[PDB]
């Protein structure tokens, strides 16, 4: 059975390059083309070219001429895509995807991209690894309904951040928001929970914030 | 290069209804047209290749039609799994281009938001920055105005916001807005407010608090 497994998230300074690998299994590597397709946060999809592992041929849209290189090692069934001269607009998720190989009557365009790797988030920024600081979000008093509390996870890099509540035991009512990119180059997000008022002074609410790229975890108590 | 236009970009429909999605190409692409489906955090999935052939294992409620310039993808009756983004992709001429995507979202009864406001913490004031958060919880449709007032002064461009995907259980949206001020700015004013406008309330709702009078 068919899988494409790509390598882990990377972060890069502008000017540098990135090489993403794609290990295939469940099929004859040498009989299908490999495609690379990227997607920028919030945006659509952009084909970056393809390669035939069988013949070692490559082809790239003009957009990417000189910047993309695709290579393969047949012995370990893995494809590679390198992108150079990175700019912050190259920040995207990169996918490898497989399509039917040569070729009988353009069948390589006839069929589409049927199996995809899980994606690899590449981040180009001049920022540097930094853990978040977590601040509480609490109402101004215990009002005269239902209430809401939260965690503000400010100033970290890179993505992602995971947040649970009371060590995962609190699920119903949680909204964890997509991170925003701040103009300082650092990310920020908030996570909130709606609970009935009658329970405020009676149970503790903690949020659990994990940022694996900086290796930091923070349990933060919220109250009013 | 061939440009593909998808109409409309957004579609709101109930489970069970048919969906009709349009892909227009700037020049002819014969029948080399593919559709993909994508859900958040997931790789795209092939549905249709060569304009009208279903990919292996794709269920029969999807079918596509058209050739040359105008193409339709039809989802004959919508299941919860079918609310996603759909992309078309032309495969006649380099570079293989994708359209901008149509988002198929769930339609439900209008629901007013609950509004909450949070002052910056004392923890955070020690740094010389203040973040004030406003929360709009559980509303439908997606359109909402949030307005920041500080001592009646409207604040424009010093706040960022984001919105959750449509909610698993009740198809609602939620929104978080962060107004950031320097500590000096924050300490110099007294009233902070969050005014939100939404289809579900016949009157603009305001939540405020008084600095240091909390
Ligand atoms: C880089 C290349 O062309 N081929 C390598 C081969 O030399 C190596 O012994 C093997 C083990 O990881 O991986 C493949
Ligand atoms: Cl070789
Ligand atoms: Cl399905
Ligand atoms: Cl004062």
Author numbering:
A (entry chain H): 1 to 144, 147 to 226
B (entry chain L): 1 to 214
Task: Quote what the paper states about this structure.
TRAIL activates two distinct receptors, TRAIL-R1 (DR4)5 and TRAIL-R2 (DR5)678, both of which possess a death domain (DD) in their cytoplasmic tail that can interact with the apoptotic machinery. The assembly and trimerization of TRAIL-R1 and TRAIL-R2 are prerequisites for transducing an apoptosis signal. We generated a novel anti-TRAIL-R2 monoclonal antibody, KMTR2, which acts as a direct agonist possessing the ability to induce apoptosis without cross-linking. KMTR2 can oligomerize soluble TRAIL-R2 fused with the Fc region of IgG (ecTRAIL-R2:Fc) and clusters membrane TRAIL-R2 on cell surfaces without cross-linking, inducing the death of human tumor cells in vitro and established tumors in vivo.
The tertiary structure of KMTR2-Fab without ecTRAIL-R2 was also determined to 2.5 Å resolution. Although the electron densities of the central part (Ser102–Tyr106) of complementarity-determining region (CDR) 3 of the heavy chain was unclear, the final model included the heavy (Gln1–Ser226, excluding Ser102–Tyr106 and Ser145–Glu146) and light (Glu1–Cys214) chains, one N-linked sugar chain at Asn73 of the KMTR2 heavy chain, two sulfate and three chloride ions, and 42 water molecules. The overall structure of KMTR2-Fab was conserved regardless of antigen binding, with an RMSD value of 1.17 Å for all main chain atoms. In the KMTR2-Fab structure without TRAIL-R2, CDR2 of the KMTR2 light chain was also involved in the interaction with neighboring molecules via crystallographic symmetry. There were some interaction residues between each CDR2 of the light chain; however, its binding mode was quite different from that in complex with TRAIL-R2.
